[PDB]
């Protein structure tokens, strides 16, 4: 494994420190032992350790300015030495002093003339979840993250480029957004903007990430509210203050769906970050998305819903009124238990009342392909498998298979269960269907493994009990799978429970069923108690917040496909008003 | 839209400020640029902006006393200039200085001799929910709301009329009741009473609103408890203090049902404000309404209930004993499945035991019209549609329609479900029926849209499954609507679930029904979890407080219609006791 290699390598490093008396004196800060190993008896002063480290690298890991200066005065070429290992490919003695906030050592390293543009491209500095931190690659990025503002400016004084980016295309501004201490990073964020070129163009705040992401836009996708609020101050204009009233004008540029994909709204709903959902509730955004839904958002959803309501009620109209026949096959020739009246008409006549079904079946297929034309959570796979069954039913049609009902049956339930997709938004039943959206694809698929286990124990027993018996009376279990299906219904207390009082029931049934009825209710009551985990207040607020998320996700969805002659752009543009042609949303609020 | 017009107009205003260098210097407080545009090069000093504003109006929006004085010394006619726009029709430069609490500017504006009676009748000053504030129209009303007591008296010093009202008929006292800061408005409320004429008659506290509402009475209807408690000090008399005991005598004039509609109790239950419900729980009112219910309130409700219990049990007595006939029509001539024994007697004989039904049917109709005579929440539409069915049944009678049962059936359920209206009050089951009162007309009408959706998917499938089959055995679904009604019962687990073990069931039934049973229980368990939202403590207190509301609403209802020889007036009158002929309620309490 990779996690054990670094565990072994870190253990392997301490061995080379103990063995090499130079690195041992560099670790323990033994000043007298260094002059004994350098000036008197010349040791290998460029001694590479297990992690490709020098004696100075060890003298910097443990804050030892004395042992560092003895190594720099007796060998001033160890300063430029980078780590020559795989885990630490690139790290130098300045990176270690900047991390440990050793200002006097950074001062002495910069007096010696160390590199202020050395990258630490080792695997331990990569942005991975198994790495506990991520401060970038450059020494300026290390100083900004640890919060040492004295070292930050001290590095700029010696020629540190704020523009420089790492292997992931992140400037020093992008790295500060991925940090825990947000309340102190806002002060650090302003400090690095002060060293910008001063020109309105080619600003550091506009340098994009390699995935097309500005520092402002990254704060929303990552869920950093403190940096989102702080970055919002730079892009909002107050119009006037009238006592308690204050009408402020927000910029509304990267926070709107104007680019083909560069949009902060399109990144909040698509990302899986549970934190980013709180950014559309922020005071520049929540005003926007509320107006997008109250007008032109909510009505178009009802139109698309009502159209889908009629389209599905038409498909059912074609099923209830389909071909007929009082059964051309002879009689109950296979087994006597058979109630079949096959309703298959391969002919295209019956013109009186069949011409209505002709256009009805034509509507169902051109709508099913339109559903697929616009496709070429869970309600997404339901609507596509529905239209797949329509074409398979159309393929089952014109071939006239005896299994003409099996593909047509799935399209019934999938067609309506996808109209409760429109429960999203619309009213206050949206959070109810997002509560079952988690239920069907969360606990259900796991909870059934425990219920099928209890069934396959009692069902495979009840069949043995009534295998000796006669299925003609009390035939709840007669087949191998029909014993499972009857016990399945018995687990939910739907069937009356096998009870024939004229005959004599086997002695094992009256014992096994008593144990089944108790265990089945305990599994059902404990299932109800397990539902109480989502009943504390936050969970009622969580699903109600997740409901607004999929409402905003629907609002952005309708704006993309719908035309532009309807649905005007958000805000009032910067033309015809003395603005910068960018949009703006006038939002006035009242304090207290 | 109207909300975008003001957004555009506010953006359009800033354009005219930037364009007009007079208004730009008036906004930016550029003193040197004003003398360059007034004394040297004469600009249009009466420059009307986009919002009908002058240069002084802009110099007052942004606290700029320097730019204001330069405009007033070089043009002392801008002070009287009001805003000449639609949004701000009437606002002057004094209103803006009073709002911003610019005391030195108000002092300088009143030294110039500005109008202290100018109304701001613009649409933005109207009492609308889209307007964030509402301070009235007069400058004295602006000073009182912002809390600047120095400007309040400074305006009175220059001839401000406290009596003046706005377009809604509200004095300065009415406006203070609609404000958030109540703890500081009580101090401001006393300040404006001190400037009253000093005579006991024509007081400012007695000037009514245009909707018949005194400042005291408005505080109760609006739900302002702090002003209700403060206003109560002026109208309560302490009789004696006996250690911990203190018997106080409350006025009880506008807080009783004496006028035809001027009554604080009649306004608390009729209004839809959820806050006003806490005013009948206040310590002058709660003592009253408790005594009104314990005696003469609760017994009369039981009498009216017991009368309605017997009146409805009589209507059922007339239905169970109605005309008979062993069926005059021939046999089962339409379809063989028919169990009809029509019980229709158009003749008025059968005198032995029919004379009891004659007066019984006469009682049911004179009581149904009495129910309508006294009519010419939900239990209000139930009782009126019940008596509507009685007359329709009376019209169905004497015409002898074969549908004589359909109008008579509705009157059965509506007659009893309106006797659990008497669960209101009576005992502690009142809050239980107010819990289902929200259920029937709240979640139910919305929750059914999701259940009918799941039914119309599985019901329209089960019919297709058993359309090939023979309805004679396993005929749960045979008609188009009977497939819906059987699946509806199956959704609530009432029917045993279609199970015929002698025949062979179609292969799609055993698959579709397994999916229906799971989805039906998940919709039922998630419905039970959705009920837990009203289980936190306040909701138990909310419905118990809403129960007392409809109890008090019933207590006031019974006092209006019932005669006056019974049910004496509340309190002890001010005659025969040295009082002012007004109630009074003696209430003693114990402190600690
Ligand atoms: N290709 C259509 C996308 O619309 B979706 C959709 C629309 C109607 C019916 C079913 C699905 C959608 C589903 C889940 C999340 C967001 C959108
Ligand atoms: N016109 C009769 C009014 O009485 B109500 C009423 C009385 C008896 C039966 C049904 C209704 C009433 C209903 C709801 C709220 C307040 C009163
Ligand atoms: C073995 C080490 N030698 C060294 O000079 N630093 C070491 C460890 C610190 C690096 C931690 C980087 C990380 O885990 O993110
Ligand atoms: C555009 C404005 N010009 C001005 O002198 N005041 C302005 C706005 C303040 C009025 C706010 C009143 C309200 O919204 O209630």
Author numbering:
A (entry chain A), B (entry chain A): 28 to 403, 422 to 637
Text of the article:
TRPV6 has four subunits that form a transmembrane domain (TMD) with a central ion channel pore, an intracellular skirt domain enclosing a large cavity, and amphipathic TRP helices that run nearly parallel to the membrane and interact with both the TMD and the skirt. The TMD is composed of transmembrane helices S1–S6 and a re-entrant pore loop (P-loop) between S5 and S6. The first four transmembrane helices form a bundle to constitute the S1–S4 domain.
The TRPV6*2-APB structure does not exhibit substantial conformational rearrangements when compared to TRPV6* (the root mean square deviation, RMSD = 0.505). In each subunit of the TRPV6*2-APB tetramer, a pocket formed by the intracellular portions of the S1–S4 helices and the membrane-facing sides of the amphipathic TRP helices contained a strong density that matches the size and shape of 2-APB and was not observed in the TRPV6* structure. Notably, this binding pocket is distinct from the pocket at the S4–S5 interface that binds an activating lipid in TRPV641, agonists, such as resiniferatoxin (RTX) and capsaicin, and antagonists, such as capsazepine (CPZ), in TRPV142, and the inhibitor econazole in TRPV543. 2-APB binding is apparently mediated by multiple interactions. E402 in S2 appears to interact with the amino group of the 2-APB tail. We have only been able to crystallize rat TRPV6 in the closed state, precluding a clear view of conformational changes associated with 2-APB-dependent inhibition.
